[PDB]
């Protein structure tokens, strides 16, 4: 398990607006948050917490760099015959659609610029590279989102999907959809197709929003295995049923140090069980005063999840 | 406030003519007359199950589906048989089998839509809807599966407004079924994750509780079923009624459900002596907790005296002393503090209505939340396994569209419902 | 001079009709004298309707009784946001009407019931549109806050959490009289276990005469509005002092009614006798404002308070050496004709902020937080223009008065 936080720069509209920037990382791992705060008096006073973190991202920080700090290690993993899992964790606008899907005030834009491609391209690269030819692994993804316990496939036209679990507890998504890639561009092709049918309010003025949780999968298959090869599950959250599942997320998570259900641990639910397992987790924080409570609350519920490391 | 019951299948429509038998009577509402009411005020809060289309016909809004056309013709041909408007009969002539995916994925998902049209014309009704009464059994085709299925649709539609189910969970000695706990895992599943108040009653606890508490010899289903409908009256409609401490479907249901399982219940009615001689009287009230709090008298099978409570609702109607009603519960708290469970401080959820049960003087519902009811789900729990290991009846159910996997979840499921119950009990 | 007062919610209007009985009947004023100087608001009909069809019918002008005979909604959401807002213009016309017409006014006694849908969230923006339009005078709210036990609606903590939040940063000082707390006094202090709302009406009816109507009256030690909240808050937060009354005796049952000063002081500490269900249960008083009434000589006050300050199982605050308002008045009180009323000839209507609702709030927030932790009536405000940014938000806002009303006391 690691742990990262990438604080994003200050937008224009927040700078017009002249929010200050609370937020200083001044280390590779030192978090600060300059808390304003006031006392009854209204004496105005900082209150500067300090955090630390596996990695921590300045505003400076592009999307290669933290893909390079958090998913890219993990890419292994999968190819070990692991399951990997990556999530971007933290308040609306924050910058979580950003750095998986790709750039974009809108959080929806260029898919090569994210995550999902940057981790996809590794994965034809190192499937390329000796060791593992000789697997003759097949790559398959698949992208989904859970919106209020419901499972909807946007590689297939938002699709609801039914998800059943056995006795043996072991679940499974029946109907899901998986498309066989064999480059990276087909990859950009499933994540743009994806990423427009993601779920949403009405057009809004600007930016998307994340009403759902977004899951996008890279399987490695060569006939089944343990079910798989491998499989890596990147995850776009929803802005921090919601609240149940992120409560989830944390136990189920820290669960995997050692070894109240909700719809998308249950989907995930293999990726944590196993003994061969990593996950990272990206704290996205907005610098802007404003942002202050929002930001303690993301960066807390980070440090309990470190916690188990 | 408002409610609409439903009828599924054929029990939970046996029923439908017995709750409605009651009811009516417990608000003058004749075949199809009017409102006779010895009084006034049984007509003040009516509404809650009828519909102002004439003017002395207040039609009951509850409906009837069933894949089995001889039901719904022997309740449509019989006494208060006459007064449904024929648009709640929601029938299916198919072959109404008795199983839980024929009448929940096959067939009854036909008939679904022609159903929810009008559960969707009841709701628009008028005023504010509150929720829907459902009765039903877990041993069935049109009971578990269609009518397991009308629910799922409905929280769907209203995840506001509450939903109330009276499931006649299979009843152990004796099974009045085969697969009983084929059609019964699969529908306590859909139960778990869509209803929010569930009354389980059982045939054999109704027995018992018929022919030694009521010496009655010979307890044709009529009474059984009369039984309960008392039951369900003083439920709902009852607290529709005016009282010093009135509650409603929520105060109900926000006071019985520390969990949001959804959590099932055990109701109990109060005054329950035999006819003549028994008419004891003995009712002034630490009668009637007396009564309500003992095992025997428990509509359901299990025995509370097997496991702590997490709500205890007596939901009273009768005139008497807020003093003599809030005062007996609580040596009736600390007389079992053993099984009440603590980290409650007061697990009893006093109700108090007025007016009583037409000819009687004072009476007392109880809508027991015990963990006991673990003790049940566990035993329909294990003659699933004991029968799906070697996948038994288990054709009838696939060959109609089924998965292997769809019993391994209901059970799982459910079988995980009876875990976490007892994460109280301790 | 003056203090307009509105009325809002069937409850603010049922208690205003009774306030407003008490009135006429201890200025010699019958059914038709002079001209009120006041407002009503409900968006229930049936409700103002009886001030329209009731007694005191041609009291008032139909010009000062406003209706929306659109829906009530026992929801806040609504009350405020959706409906209420429609009315509100409506509303504040009047209260900029009425509020021109007299001379150098000092504020609004405002009516509200709390927990109810026209009384805590209309009010909200009521006195919201106040704050700013008047932002220079008094903004005494006076509230029934939530029965501890025996409240009525479902959702009332909903209704109260809210309307707490959005008159905080808009109210000068909000006299508190809690419903049931007032029943005890009914069963307790005067014994009827018949007690009609329109007794609490005529009970508050009291304790609140004693605050406008004599205190604006000529007296020996005279106390304007501004006066209190002055020597009533400490502290910015619109803080909510508690009404008590003494002479609650029976005009019946037991008769010693002759009860000295020196008794009918005594008579206010005393936890059952507080329009209120928070008994000082450790709240040390940080300021009171006791309104005496009738024949009263100064000393037996300036000694009668003495003998209190040095009773110290009344301790007051640590930063407060004094904190005792004493108002005299001349007139004795005037008790309705025929009710249950005692009648005494002198009583002391004493209010003050106690660190004991650091109790009565916290039981109330908690309330709130079960049922939103599953959201339950949450539907129901949404769907009228409200977010989960509004009860999220107005929930973290009380906290930090369980906070504060924790910090200006328990510590030295």
């Known amino acids: ?309 | 406030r408002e409610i609409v019951h439903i009828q599924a299948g054929q029990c939970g429509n046996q029923i439908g003519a017995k709750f409605w038998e009651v009811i009516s009577d417990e608000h003058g509402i004749d075949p199809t007359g009017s409102y006779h009411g010895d009084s006034d005020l049984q007509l003040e809060r009516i509404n809650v199950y009828y519909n102002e289309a004439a003017g002395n016909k207040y039609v009951p809004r509850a409906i009837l589906v069933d894949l089995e056309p001889g039901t719904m013709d022997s309740v449509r041909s019989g006494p208060f048989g006459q007064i449904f408007r024929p648009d709640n009969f929601v029938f299916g002539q198919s072959g109404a089998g008795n199983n839980w995916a024929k009448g929940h994925y096959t067939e009854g998902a036909e008939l679904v839509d022609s159903v929810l049209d009008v559960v969707r014309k009841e709701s628009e009704s008028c005023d504010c809807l509150q929720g829907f009464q459902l009765t039903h059994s877990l041993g069935g085709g049109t009971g578990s599966g269609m009518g397991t299925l009308l629910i799922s649709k409905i929280r769907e539609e209203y995840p506001d407004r509450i939903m109330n189910t009276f499931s006649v969970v299979p009843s152990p000695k004796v099974s009045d079924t085969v697969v009983e706990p084929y059609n019964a895992t699969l529908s306590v599943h859909q139960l778990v994750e869509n209803t929010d108040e569930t009354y389980c009653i059982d045939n054999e606890a109704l027995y018992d509780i018929c022919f030694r508490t009521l010496k009655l010899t010979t307890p044709t289903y009529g009474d059984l079923n009369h039984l309960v409908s008392a039951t369900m009256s003083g439920v709902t409609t009852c607290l529709r009624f005016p009282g010093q401490l009135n509650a409603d479907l929520r105060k109900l249901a926000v006071n019985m459900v520390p969990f949001p399982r959804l959590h099932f219940f055990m109701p109990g009615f109060a005054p329950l002596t035999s006819r003549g001689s028994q008419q004891y009287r003995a009712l002034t009230v630490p009668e009637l907790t007396q009564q309500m709090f003992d095992a025997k008298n428990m509509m359901a099978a299990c025995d509370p005296r097997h496991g702590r409570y997490l709500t205890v609702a007596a939901v009273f109607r009768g005139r008497m002393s807020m003093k003599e009603v809030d005062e007996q519960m609580l040596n009736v708290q600390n007389k079992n503090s053993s099984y009440f469970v603590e980290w409650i401080p007061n697990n009893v959820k006093t109700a108090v209505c007025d007016i009583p049960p037409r000819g009687l003087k004072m009476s007392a519902t109880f809508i027991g939340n015990s963990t006991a009811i673990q003790e049940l789900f566990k035993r329909i729990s294990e003659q699933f396994t004991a029968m799906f290991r070697r996948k038994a009846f288990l054709h009838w159910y696939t060959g109609e569209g089924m998965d292997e996997m769809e019993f391994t979840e209901a059970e799982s499921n459910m079988n995980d419902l009876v875990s976490e119950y007892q994460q109280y009990q301790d | 001079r003056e203090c307009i007062s509105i009325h809002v919610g069937q409850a603010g209007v049922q208690i205003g009709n009774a306030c407003w009985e008490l009135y006429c009947l201890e200025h010699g004023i019958q059914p038709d004298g002079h001209v009120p100087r006041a407002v009503f608001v409900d968006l229930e009909p049936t409700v103002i309707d009886e001030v329209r069809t009731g007694t005191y019918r041609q009291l008032f002008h139909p010009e000062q009784l406003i209706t929306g005979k659109e829906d009530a909604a026992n929801n806040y959401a609504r009350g405020h946001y959706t409906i209420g807002k429609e009315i509100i213009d409506l509303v504040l016309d009047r209260i900029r009407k009425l509020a021109d017409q007299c001379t150098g006014l000092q504020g609004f006694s405002v009516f509200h019931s709390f927990g109810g849908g026209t009384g805590s969230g209309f009010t909200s923006l009521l006195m919201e549109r106040l704050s700013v339009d008047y932002g220079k005078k008094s903004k005494l709210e006076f509230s029934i806050y939530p029965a501890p036990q025996v409240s009525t609606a479902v959702v009332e903590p909903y209704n109260s959490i809210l309307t707490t939040h959005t008159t905080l940063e808009h109210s000068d000082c909000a006299f508190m009289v809690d419903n049931e707390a007032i029943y005890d006094i009914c069963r307790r202090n005067l014994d009827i276990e018949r007690p009609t709302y329109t007794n609490l009406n005529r009970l508050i009816g009291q304790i609140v005469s004693s605050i406008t109507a004599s205190l604006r009256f000529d007296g020996a030690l005279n106390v304007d509005l501004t006066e209190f909240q002055t020597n009533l808050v400490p502290y910015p937060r619109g803080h909510f002092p508690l009404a008590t009354y003494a002479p609650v005796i029976s005009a019946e049952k037991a008769y010693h009614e002759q009860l000295s000063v020196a008794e009918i002081t005594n008579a206010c500490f005393e936890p059952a006798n507080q329009m209120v269900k928070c008994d000082p249960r450790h709240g040390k008083y940080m300021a009171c404002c006791l309104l005496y009434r009738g024949d009263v000589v100064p000393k037996d006050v300036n000694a009668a308070i003495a003998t209190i300050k040095t009773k110290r199982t009344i301790q007051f605050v640590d930063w407060c050496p004094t904190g005792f308002k004493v108002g005299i008045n001349y007139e004795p009180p005037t008790v309705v004709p025929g009710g249950d009323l005692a009648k005494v000839q002198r009583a002391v209507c004493m209010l003050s902020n106690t660190t004991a609702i650091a109790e009565a709030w916290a039981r109330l927030d908690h309330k709130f937080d079960l049922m939103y932790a599953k959201r339950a009536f949450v539907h129901w405000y949404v769907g009228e223009g409200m977010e989960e940014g509004e009860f999220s938000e107005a929930r973290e806002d009380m906290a930090a008065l369980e906070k504060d009303y924790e910090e200006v006391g328990v510590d030295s």
């Open chain 1, 1 to 309: 398990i690691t742990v990262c936080v990438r604080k994003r720069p200050i937008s224009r509209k927040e700078v017009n607006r002249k929010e200050i920037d609370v937020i200083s990382v001044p280390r590779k791992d030192m978090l600060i948050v300059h808390e304003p705060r006031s006392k009854v008096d209204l004496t105005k006073f900082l209150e500067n917490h300090k955090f630390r973190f596996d990695y921590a991202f300045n505003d400076t920080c592009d999307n290669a760099m933290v893909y390079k700090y958090t998913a890219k290690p993990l890419v292994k993993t999968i190819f070990e015959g692991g399951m990997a899992t990556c999530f971007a964790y933290g308040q609306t606008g924050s910058g979580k659609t950003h750095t998986m899907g790709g750039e974009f005030n809108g959080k929806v834009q260029d898919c090569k610029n994210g995550i999902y491609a940057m981790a996809a391209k590794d994965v034809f690269v190192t499937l390329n590279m000796p060791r593992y030819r000789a697997m003759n692994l097949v790559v398959s993804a698949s992208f989904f989102e859970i919106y209020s316990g419901k499972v909807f496939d946007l590689l297939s036209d938002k699709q609801k999907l039914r998800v059943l679990e056995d006795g043996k507890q072991q679940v499974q998504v029946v109907g899901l959809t998986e498309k066989v890639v064999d480059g990276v561009e087909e990859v950009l092709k499933l994540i743009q197709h994806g990423n427009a049918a993601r779920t949403s309010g009405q057009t809004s003025a600007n930016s998307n929003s994340s009403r759902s949780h977004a899951v996008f999968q890279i399987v490695l298959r060569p006939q089944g295995s343990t079910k798989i090869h491998g499989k890596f599950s990147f995850i776009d959250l929803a802005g921090n049923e919601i609240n149940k599942s992120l409560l989830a997320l944390k136990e189920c998570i820290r669960a995997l140090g050692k070894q109240r259900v909700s719809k998308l641990t249950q989907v995930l639910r293999d990726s944590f069980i196993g003994e061969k397992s990593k996950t990272c987790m990206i704290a996205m924080i907005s610098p802007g005063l404003s942002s202050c409570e929002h930001t303690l609350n993301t960066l807390r519920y980070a440090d309990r999840v470190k916690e188990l490391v």
